[PDB]
Amino acid sequence: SMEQVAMELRLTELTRLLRSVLDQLQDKDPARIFAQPVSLKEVPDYLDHIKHPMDFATMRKRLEAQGYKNLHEFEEDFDLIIDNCMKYNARDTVFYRAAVRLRDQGGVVLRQARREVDSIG
CATH of the domain at 74: 1.20.920.10
Q: Which residues of 11-22 are buried (b: 16+ CB within 10 A; e: fewer)?
A: eeebbebbeebb
Distance CA 99, CA 83 (A): 8
**Range of the structural domain that residue 87 is part of:** 1-121
What was the structure determination method? X-ray
Cβ 101 vs Cβ 2: under 8 Å: no
Half-sphere exposure of 44 (CA within 13 A, CB side): 1
Distance CA 103, CA 98 (A): 9
Provide the number of structural domains found in the chain: 1
Amino acid type, 72: H
Vertex 85: Cα angle to 111 and 19 (nearest 5): 40
Number of other residues whose CB lies within 10 A of the CB of residue 98: 20
Half-sphere exposure of 98 (CA within 13 A, CB side): 18
Distance CA 91, CA 48 (A): 20
Query: For residue 32, is it left (φ>0), alpha (ψ between -120 and 50) or beta?
Result: left
